[PDB]
Amino acid sequence: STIALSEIVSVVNTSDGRLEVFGVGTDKAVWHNRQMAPHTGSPWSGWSSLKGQVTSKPVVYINTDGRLEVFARGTDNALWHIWQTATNAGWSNWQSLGGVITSNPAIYANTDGRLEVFARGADNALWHISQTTAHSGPWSSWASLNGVITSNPTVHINSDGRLEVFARGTDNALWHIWQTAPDSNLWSSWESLNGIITSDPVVIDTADGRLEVFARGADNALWHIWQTISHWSGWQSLNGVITSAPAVAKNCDNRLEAFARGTDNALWHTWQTVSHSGPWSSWQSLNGVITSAPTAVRDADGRLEVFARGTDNALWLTWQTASSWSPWISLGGVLIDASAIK
Amino acid sequence: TIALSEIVSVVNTSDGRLEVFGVGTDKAVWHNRQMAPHTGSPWSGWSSLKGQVTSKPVVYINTDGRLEVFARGTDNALWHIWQTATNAGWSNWQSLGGVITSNPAIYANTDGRLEVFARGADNALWHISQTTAHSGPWSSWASLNGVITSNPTVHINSDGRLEVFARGTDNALWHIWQTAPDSNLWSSWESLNGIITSDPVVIDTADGRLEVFARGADNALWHIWQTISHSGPWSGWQSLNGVITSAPAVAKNCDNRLEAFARGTDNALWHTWQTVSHSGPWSSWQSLNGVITSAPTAVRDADGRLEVFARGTDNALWLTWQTASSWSPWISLGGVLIDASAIK
Ligand SMILES: C[C@@H]1O[C@@H](C[C@H]2C[C@@H](CO)O[C@@H](O)C2)[C@@H](O)[C@H](O)[C@@H]1O
Ligand SMILES: C[C@@H]1O[C@@H](C[C@H]2C[C@@H](CO)O[C@@H](O)C2)[C@@H](O)[C@H](O)[C@@H]1O
Ligand SMILES: C[C@@H]1O[C@@H](C[C@H]2C[C@@H](CO)O[C@@H](O)C2)[C@@H](O)[C@H](O)[C@@H]1O
Ligand SMILES: C[C@@H]1O[C@@H](C[C@H]2C[C@@H](CO)O[C@@H](O)C2)[C@@H](O)[C@H](O)[C@@H]1O
Ligand SMILES: C[C@@H]1O[C@@H](C[C@H]2C[C@@H](CO)O[C@@H](O)C2)[C@@H](O)[C@H](O)[C@@H]1O
Ligand SMILES: C[C@@H]1O[C@@H](C[C@H]2C[C@@H](CO)O[C@@H](O)C2)[C@@H](O)[C@H](O)[C@@H]1O
Ligand SMILES: C[C@@H]1O[C@@H](C[C@H]2C[C@@H](CO)O[C@@H](O)C2)[C@@H](O)[C@H](O)[C@@H]1O
Ligand SMILES: C[C@@H]1O[C@@H](C[C@H]2C[C@@H](CO)O[C@@H](O)C2)[C@@H](O)[C@H](O)[C@@H]1O
Ligand SMILES: C[C@@H]1O[C@@H](C[C@H]2C[C@@H](CO)O[C@@H](O)C2)[C@@H](O)[C@H](O)[C@@H]1O
Ligand SMILES: C[C@@H]1O[C@@H](C[C@H]2C[C@@H](CO)O[C@@H](O)C2)[C@@H](O)[C@H](O)[C@@H]1O
Ligand SMILES: C[C@@H]1O[C@@H](C[C@H]2C[C@@H](CO)O[C@@H](O)C2)[C@@H](O)[C@H](O)[C@@H]1O
Ligand SMILES: [Cl-]
């Protein structure tokens, strides 16, 4: 009935290459903050409200026309959304997509540009709904993929265009289910990848087109598992002792880099050395005192930026410099953890 | 007349390997691909996809990861061949009909439907598209009018609208765009002025602005750009100097710094690059040596390094890439390639 502490924001690279973060304020509204300019260390806009009243982490996704769209569980437990009405410009009103959900929503674009949203239902199964045409309503009917899940779901597209969803099962193993063809409503059966996981799964598509899943294990280390050929391996440990969900992102050269809170409440990281096919470093501290999981993203200068909530409940930020990382700086605001599953 | 063309079409496959496509002495399409997703990977060697082509062959990756090659045939129709699956074999060559007079230019709409553009016998711009994402059947051909004198170049805007560029009859750079993503409604043709003496090369910058590169009347490398993400007004033309004897090729370093490549007056490969960051000033031109007989083709590999291909004095495809501090010694991938560009 427990997962590692969640991320405090959802992040996206905008149509024009800037970082934009979304989180939940003390009023339960979705707020957001963005870089002025597409560069590491740009000034930030400060927090502005998109209003609403939410009961999940708000999750941003960029439509294939560049319009941001934010999905969140509402006060009636329906899936709600709000979208830019023109690329990188004004926002709509909040609208309901109905349903009854009991997790944070997870989103990906099909190969046809239709966004598809996945979330745990009132029956604890995985449900989904999608745009009927590319980056546009109306939306489909809600449909079930069955199963019984106990984490937030995570979706990613394979290198052949098939969506695949990952979630913790009732035996605490990592389970997954996939599209049998791109854009399809036909899916495989649920299948177990075994292991024990104690966080939401984090899924990345490698430079060589293989899905790779990261999760906290029963021993509180960071573990991972991967497809052996483009579109599985044994579970393998990357060690560490982590007190939050992990975050993973790709460097300029596609080397993966994993971030998580330590038992000292500092941010810690481990990275692939040499290349995207290389072995992982041992862990190193990036300091700070943080009160959420980190959120990691590559910016328009090819530099990793990491966000995490601080002891004052503001969002703080550190990034890669030529040969080190920048001192933690505050972006202000007061953010709450509204994750539907804690 | 246009500056000497690129000799190959290159792509980063869905599993992170570079794959190049060219025309052999037999007029067939040949290809060569990295075994591994890394700078300096060994190569397959040249093998034939057959066909007899009469344009540059142009590869594009469908949104399901399957490569698809487009080329003009001996009957002047558009022809194509595609992978049946991402790491499987190829279809037979199949005709999309029409009669075309340029190399094809391809881009995916926001709905995953490929759209192909080519000049017609009337010298207008024509187009045809997949009816559903990454799949046949295709639409009927239709015209976007105009009178064009180079190969066309297409790129998607950061708001999803396709936009096509081509030299006009006054030798200026002209363009035309979708009014909405996935749409069959387009703007009128509009001039961006200047004089161009190569095909246009079009990039979408890290900040979502289309930027076009072309050789000028003075044989320098020139460029012009949208000043606002997916929007006019455009800049005026600006020179990046140099004196170039081929079409330019442009690619993004992993940090998004643009880098332009072209054959020099000494027939070596030369380049100029943005300094500091993706909105910084360009360097002076510097030589990467070699003696080349086509325009270069530049592409960022799965290690985030630039790799540049060009035909050599023996008509083989040669290759140099970025290393930590410099560039690798030119190396040969063999083969014998011809310039089959439908417009020269
Ligand atoms: C995310 C938001 O954070 C603070 C406002 C921000 C508004 C902004 C105005 O410029 O200033 C920042 O420092 C504070 C709180 O008062 C809000 O209830 C909300 O939790
Ligand atoms: C995310 C949603 O948030 C509010 C929507 C209202 C937000 C308001 C902002 O002005 O607009 C009104 O039309 C809708 C709640 O009432 C809903 O139950 C839901 O939790
Ligand atoms: C995600 C998994 O979900 C159920 C199995 C699924 C197996 C499947 C058989 O193919 O049928 C579905 O309805 C039930 C549970 O019993 C497992 O412990 C796990 O939580
Ligand atoms: C993800 C990991 O899952 C189990 C080990 C796995 C090791 C693997 C062989 O390497 O076999 C699998 O069946 C079990 C747990 O004991 C670990 O603490 C961790 O939670
Ligand atoms: C994420 C932030 O972490 C610490 C400050 C950092 C300040 C920084 C100075 O640049 O030094 C680092 O070692 C510590 C806390 O005091 C803040 O409230 C916040 O929780
Ligand atoms: C691109 C092709 O290039 C050569 C064959 C290549 C075959 C390869 C071994 O299969 O060896 C390489 O060195 C040469 C020519 O003879 C063909 O007509 C065609 O122009
Ligand atoms: C690109 C095309 O290439 C050949 C046909 C292909 C037809 C196919 C039959 O399925 O076989 C392949 O080897 C050759 C020519 O005859 C066509 O006019 C066209 O130029
Ligand atoms: C690409 C351009 O194409 C024609 C004009 C187009 C302008 C437009 C009139 O508004 O109508 C279209 O059919 C014709 C030529 O006259 C120009 O020199 C140029 O080559
Ligand atoms: C792209 C360039 O086009 C013309 C000049 C442009 C320079 C620009 C400077 O302000 O103004 C525009 O109207 C014309 C030619 O003379 C150049 O050799 C080159 O072909
Ligand atoms: C692409 C290169 O372009 C010119 C030089 C550039 C060299 C640079 C450094 O002097 O200055 C710029 O104005 C001109 C020619 O001399 C080279 O042979 C080559 O064709
Ligand atoms: C692109 C290639 O260019 C030269 C070789 C390069 C070999 C290299 C030594 O590794 O030195 C450089 O200066 C020249 C020519 O001799 C080749 O036939 C070919 O056209
Ligand atoms: Cl790097």
For B272, the token pair is 């100029």
CB A134: neighbour CB atoms within 10 A? 23
How far apart are alpha carbons B136 and A123 in whole angstroms?
A: 40
Instruction: Tell me the binding residues of B for Mg(2+).
Output: 12-13
Coil, helix or strand at residue B221:
strand
CA A229 from chain centre, in angstroms, equals: 24
For residue B105, give the nearest of B165, B178, B154 by alpha carbon: B154
Q: Which atom of ligand 1 is nearest to the CA of A31?
A: 1
Q: Is A325 among the annotated ligand-binding positions?
A: yes
What are the Cα distances from residue A307, in Å, to A31, A252, A295, A331? 15, 18, 5, 9
Question: Using what technique was this structure determined?
Answer: X-ray
Ligand 6 pocket, Cβ-based, cut-off 6 angstroms: B 24-26, 30, 45-46, 334-337
Number of inter-chain CB pairs under 8 A, A vs B:
152
- Of the listed ligands, the closest to the CA of B196 is 9
Closest CA of chain B from A63, distance in Å: 9
How far apart are alpha carbons B155 and A116 in whole angstroms?
A: 26
How far apart are alpha carbons A152 and A236 in whole angstroms?
A: 22
Interior angle at CA B336, CA B334 and CA B342, nearest 5: 135
Q: Are A329 and A20 in contact (CB under 8 A)?
A: no
How far apart are alpha carbons A23 and A44 in whole angstroms?
A: 15
How far apart are alpha carbons A233 and A272 in whole angstroms?
A: 18
- The DSSP bridge pattern shows strands A95-96 and A79-83 to be antiparallel
Chain B CB contacts of A229 below 8 Å: 87
For residue A315, give the nearest of A49, A56, A46 by alpha carbon: A46
Interior angle at CA B222, CA B221 and CA B228, nearest 5: 140
Question: Read out DSSP for A253-321?
Answer: TS-EEEEEEBTTS-EEEEEB-SSTTSPBPPPEE----BSSB-EEEE-TTS-EEEEEEBTTS-EEEEEB-
Closest CA of chain A from B110, distance in Å: 5
Q: Are B115 and B128 in contact (CB under 8 A)?
A: yes
Ligand 6 pocket test, pick from B336, B337, B339 with the greatest ligand atom count within 8 Å of Cβ, gives B336
Give kind and range of the element (H or E) at residue A108: strand A106-109
What are the Cα distances from residue A258, in Å, to A202, A222, A238, A306, B88? 10, 9, 10, 11, 33
CA A324 / ligand 4 centre spacing (Å)? 34
Compute φ and ψ for B60, nearest 5 degrees: -140, 145
Coil, helix or strand at residue B93:
coil
| Cα Rg of chain A, angstroms | 19
Burial (0-12, 13-18, 19+ Cβ within 10 Å), B87: middle
Q: Are A147 and A126 in contact (CB under 8 A)?
A: yes
In the sheet that holds A304-309, the strands lie side by side as: A295-298, A304-309, A315-319, A329-330
How far apart are alpha carbons A62 and A18 in whole angstroms?
A: 12
**Integer distance in angstroms from the first to the last C-alpha of chain A?**
8
Q: What are the extents of the domains in chain B?
A: 1-55+247-344
- Residue B135 region by backbone torsions, left for phi larger than 0, else alpha for psi between -120 and 50, else beta: beta
Ligand 7 pocket, Cβ-based, cut-off 6 angstroms: B 50-53, 73-75, 79, 92-93
- Which residue puts its alpha carbon closest to atom 12 of ligand 4? A195
Name the residue type at position B190.
E
What are the Cα distances from residue B162, in Å, to A49, B108, B174, B201? 33, 9, 14, 15
Contact map slice: A 256-295 vs B, CB within 8 A:
275-277
Q: Is A116 among the annotated ligand-binding positions?
A: no
Taking the Cβ of residue A88 and every Cβ of chain B, the question of whether any pair is shorter than 8 Å is answered with: yes
CB pair distance less than 8 Å for B302 and A254: yes
Cβ of A235 closer than 6 Å to ligand 4, yes or no, is yes
Taking the Cβ of residue B99 and every Cβ of chain A, the question of whether any pair is shorter than 8 Å is answered with: no
List helix spans (H) across chain B. Answer: none
For residue B61, give the nearest of B133, B2, B143, B168 by alpha carbon: B133
CB A43: neighbour CB atoms within 10 A? 9
How far apart are alpha carbons B93 and B56 in whole angstroms?
A: 15
- The DSSP bridge pattern shows strands A236-237 and A222-226 to be antiparallel
Burial (0-12, 13-18, 19+ Cβ within 10 Å), B284: exposed
Q: Is A179 among the annotated ligand-binding positions?
A: no
CB A229: neighbour CB atoms within 10 A? 10
Closest CA of chain A from B252, distance in Å: 11
CA B205 / ligand 7 centre spacing (Å)? 38
Residues 6+ apart with CB under 8 A from B276: none
Strand partners, A330: A316
Q: Which atom of ligand 2 is nearest to the CA of A53?
A: 3
CA A325 / ligand 1 centre spacing (Å)? 27
CB A20: neighbour CB atoms within 10 A? 21
What would the CATH number be for the domain defined by A10-336?
2.120.10.70
CA B84 / ligand 12 centre spacing (Å)? 34
Q: Are A192 and A173 in contact (CB under 8 A)?
A: yes
Chain A CB contacts of B209 below 8 Å: 16
Give residue for tokens 């012009």: B224
CB pair distance less than 8 Å for A39 and B279: yes
Cβ of A237 closer than 6 Å to ligand 4, yes or no, is no
The length of chain B, given as a count of residues: 344
Chain B CB contacts of A88 below 8 Å: 208, 229
Coil, helix or strand at residue A134:
coil
The DSSP 8-state label assigned to residue A244 in this structure reads: S
For residue B107, give the nearest of B161, B41, B156 by alpha carbon: B156
Long-range contacts of A210-213 (CB under 8 A, 24+ apart): A210/A159, A210/B15, A211/A156, A211/A158, A211/A164, A212/A256, A213/A166, A213/A174
Name the residue type at position A127.
W
Compute φ and ψ for A247, nearest 5 degrees: -130, 140
Coil, helix or strand at residue B189:
coil
CB A263: neighbour CB atoms within 10 A? 11
Q: Are A130 and A146 in contact (CB under 8 A)?
A: no
CA B304 / ligand 7 centre spacing (Å)? 37
How far apart are alpha carbons A190 and A57 in whole angstroms?
A: 25
Taking the Cβ of residue A135 and every Cβ of chain B, the question of whether any pair is shorter than 8 Å is answered with: yes
CA B317 / ligand 6 centre spacing (Å)? 11
Strand partners, B227: none
Residues 6+ apart with CB under 8 A from A328: A287, A288, A310, A316, A317, A318
How far apart are alpha carbons B119 and B117 in whole angstroms?
A: 7
CB pair distance less than 8 Å for B181 and A65: yes
Compute φ and ψ for A263, nearest 5 degrees: -70, -20
Taking the Cβ of residue A321 and every Cβ of chain B, the question of whether any pair is shorter than 8 Å is answered with: no
- The DSSP bridge pattern shows strands B18-24 and B8-12 to be antiparallel
Interior angle at CA B11, CA B10 and CA B16, nearest 5: 135
Question: Read out DSSP for A167-213?
Answer: EEBTTS-EEEEEBSSTT-S-BPPPEE--S--SS--EEEE-TTS-EEE
Taking the Cβ of residue B16 and every Cβ of chain A, the question of whether any pair is shorter than 8 Å is answered with: yes
